[PDB]
Structure 1
Amino acid sequence: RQMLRKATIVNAGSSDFLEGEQVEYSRVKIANRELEANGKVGATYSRDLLGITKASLATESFISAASFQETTRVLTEAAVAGKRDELRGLKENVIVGRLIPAGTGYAYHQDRMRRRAAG
């Protein structure tokens, strides 16, 4: 399932997809739920394939990815796009010395979610 993390877009909404977009599987369903409730244009997808290294490089955590390998390549990728990391991931929190967001800490980290909704 982690290897199915990202997919290939055929056709957009009013957002910036188009042929051969390389977006996350979850973001796809995002767009779906949102826009198909209003109508407009829902995007078509097909899931694509990431094996190990690929999948790792795909993830929405550059800290996690940089912790893996190809640190050089990785980091400039990140730097260029101005990528933002919200600390969903585990090794993320590891490296920040924070509350791992599984079990024991999962509770605390989900609490921060509603803290983002209100102040």
Structure 2
Amino acid sequence: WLSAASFQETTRVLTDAAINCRSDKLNGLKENVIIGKLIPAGTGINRYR
């Protein structure tokens, strides 16, 4: 819900996520950027870090 909220229609995404009580597995690139953790790409892959 974090990536979709930051993309577009933040109100609709946030309210539907709140209704559905969605949990965001911080596994994406945009989300890891938002929380300020290493992006799972490039020199962030578990192999390389």
Q: Above 0.5 in TM-score?
A: yes
TM-score normalised to structure 1 length: 0.38
Q: CA deviation at 1:64?
A: 0.3
Query: What percent of counterpart residues are identical?
Result: 68
Q: CA deviation at 1:103?
A: 2.0
Q: CA deviation at 1:104?
A: 1.1
1:68 partnered with 2:26: no
Q: Per chain length, whose mean CA-contact separation is higher, i.e. which structure has more relative contact order (CA < 8 Å, sep 6+)?
A: 2
**Poorly superposed stretches of 4+, deviation over 3 Å:** none
Distance 1:104 1:77 in 2: 34
Larger Rg: 1
Q: How many residues align?
A: 47
Structure having the larger proportion of residues in strand: 1
How large is the RMSD of aligned CA atoms in angstroms?
Answer: 1.2
> Structure 2: any 5+ residue segments left out of the alignment?
none
> Structure 1: any 5+ residue segments left out of the alignment?
1-61, 109-119
Distance 1:105 1:85 in 2: 20
Structure having the larger proportion of residues in helix: 1
TM-score normalised to structure 2 length: 0.86
